[PDB]
Design an enzyme around this catalytic site. Structure first.
Site, short mmCIF file in Angstrom:
data_model
loop_
_atom_site.label_atom_id
_atom_site.label_comp_id
_atom_site.label_asym_id
_atom_site.label_seq_id
_atom_site.Cartn_x
_atom_site.Cartn_y
_atom_site.Cartn_z
N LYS A 115 0.91 -1.29 0.13
CA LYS A 115 0.03 0.00 -0.12
C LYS A 115 0.90 1.11 0.06
CE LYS A 115 -1.40 -0.91 4.85
NZ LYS A 115 -0.70 -2.15 4.82
N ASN A 138 -2.03 7.01 6.27
CA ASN A 138 -1.13 6.11 7.06
C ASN A 138 0.37 5.96 6.53
OD1 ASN A 138 -1.00 2.52 7.41
ND2 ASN A 138 -1.54 3.95 8.94
N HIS A 183 -2.93 -8.40 11.58
CA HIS A 183 -3.68 -7.62 12.71
C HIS A 183 -4.68 -8.66 13.36
CE1 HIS A 183 -1.48 -4.09 11.19
NE2 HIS A 183 -2.26 -4.32 9.78
#
Ligand SMILES: N#Cc1ccc(COc2ccc3cc(S(=O)(=O)N[C@H]4CC[C@@H](C(=O)O)C[C@H]4C(=O)O)ccc3c2)c(F)c1
Ligand SMILES: [Cl-]
Length: 435
Positions: A115, A138, A183
């Site tokens: 990303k 982010n 995560h």
């Protein structure tokens, strides 16, 4: 949105929490701030007029609020936040606040791997077209720090956590690049719950860009696709050469790129699909693909000396990312692989298939070092710290070897962030890798 008169509580400080504080103050609203850390970063920068509560959450403040602005670093499922939600108290994050204000189109990028590279590449494609572009989220700046009336395009890297608190994104182009286990410490309903958070990015997107080779990137229920041997954007292999193609038409021979490797070629395809969808000129987009050098800490050669390559891949914070570094990796001699940190409850097993043979050694450290060593104990050493692991492996390095930090874990058990882990690796590589 109009916040005047509201009782606003911000959970989490640091640069992002500060950007939220500043956002409200500039609109004549004095928020209150809380953080479960006693001394969070940016505390000394918080104006004394802003009340703060640190070292725990304050449920009196949360239950009194008209709006709670939650850092992505706190779970919505935290009992204090679920109580506020049950009471009908609105909870958003910084990305939601940004989307309500932005006056330029937004390209929005998420995924388990790639990303930052794709976000940065689309940014460079916009710059090469002479477009005034704000790139962040982010990565780089917190998104609220990008807001500017002169901005013509925003390109945001968004995490699954940011997406859980965002409802008003209407991206001109949005992608999930891939979904691989990550995560899990924040997703007790497992892979599908994590996937569901990323799927939010497509809601009200004008164009969705999906990965033809990863079904989890597709909405549950008309997207443009990228992939290796299939997709609207795909790769065409020609006799020890690779081309980027769009619907059958060659657009770039990857020899012109500075990035290498299949997963960076599919990153380039995804970036091109997004840029095309955002209306950027194809020619300048292709030019940006040829100039982009890579990000720091992302399979970065920090020293090549005396026949040994020392590679900082500190940005590899999950199993999928380490797999991308290892899959197809060429090593002349021995691979000395550094693994460790906080693995976020990941299953590390998928790495084991890359770890066979006589030419691999593992040096495993941090919180989950023992689990990592267990991938192949016969070739593994475990230490407390990365520095200890480096000092242990360095005497064994021979001409032809590779030393690879690609740790498959977050850094926060021992480091400020993955950049610090990478910088510390680079310093030690320079010490240990010359006479
Ligand atoms: N109350 C409170 C509170 C509110 C916010 C914060 C911090 O702000 C964040 C915001 C996002 C966070 C995300 C994570 S993570 O588990 O997803 N880890 C990632 C971020 C750190 C990266 C690194 O190692 O530098 C690794 C990265 C990852 O994806 O693994 C971990 C901690 C995070 C903290 C905090 F510490 C406390
Ligand atoms: Cl081999």
């Amino acid at each position: 949105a109009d916040y005047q008169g509201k009782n606003v509580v911000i959970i989490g400080l640091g640069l992002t929490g500060l950007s939220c504080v500043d956002f409200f103050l500039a609109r004549g609203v004095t928020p209150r701030v809380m953080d479960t850390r006693m001394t969070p970063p940016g505390l000394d920068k918080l104006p004394e007029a802003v009340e703060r509560h640190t070292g725990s959450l304050n449920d009196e403040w949360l239950m009194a609020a008209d709006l709670i602005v939650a850092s992505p670093g706190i779970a919505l499922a935290h009992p204090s936040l679920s109580a506020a939600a049950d009471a009908g108290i609105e909870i958003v994050g910084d990305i939601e606040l940004f989307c309500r204000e932005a006056q330029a189109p937004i390209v929005a990028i998420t995924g388990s791997n790639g990303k930052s590279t794709v976000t940065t590449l689309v940014g460079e494609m916009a710059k090469a077209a002479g477009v005034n572009v704000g790139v962040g989220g982010n990565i780089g700046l917190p998104a609220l720090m990008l807001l500017d009336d002169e901005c013509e395009l925003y390109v945001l890297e968004l995490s699954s956590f940011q997406l859980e608190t965002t409802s008003s994104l209407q991206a001109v182009a949005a992608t999930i690049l891939n979904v691989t286990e990550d995560h899990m410490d924040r997703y007790p309903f497992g892979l599908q719950q994590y996937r569901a958070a990323k799927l939010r990015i497509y809601e009200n997107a004008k164009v969705c860009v999906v990965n033809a080779d990863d079904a989890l990137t597709m909405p549950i229920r008309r997207c443009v696709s990228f992939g290796v041997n299939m997709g609207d954007y795909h790769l065409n292999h020609q006799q020890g050469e690779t081309w980027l193609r769009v619907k059958g038409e060659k657009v770039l021979n990857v020899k012109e790129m500075k990035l290498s490797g299949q997963h960076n070629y599919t990153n380039a395809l995804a970036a091109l699909a997004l840029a095309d969808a955002a209306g950027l000129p194809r020619a300048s987009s292709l030019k940006a693909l040829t100039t982009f050098t890579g990000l720091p800490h992302r399979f970065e050669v920090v020293l090549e000396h005396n026949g040994v390559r020392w590679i900082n891949d500190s940005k590899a914070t999950n199993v999928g990312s380490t797999e991308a570094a290892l899959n197809g990796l060429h090593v002349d001699g021995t691979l000395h692989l550094l693994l460790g940190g906080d693995g976020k409850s990941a299953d590390f097993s998928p790495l084991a298939r890359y770890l066979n043979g006589d030419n691999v050694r593992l040096y495993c450290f941090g919180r989950d070092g023992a689990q990592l060593a267990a991938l192949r104990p016969e070739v593994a050493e475990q230490t407390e710290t990365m520095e200890q692991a480096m000092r242990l492996l360095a005497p064994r390095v021979q001409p032809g070897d590779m030393v690879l930090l690609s740790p498959a874990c977050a850094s926060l058990d021992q480091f400020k962030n993955f950049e610090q882990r990478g910088n510390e690796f680079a310093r030690l590589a320079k010490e240990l890798g010359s006479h």
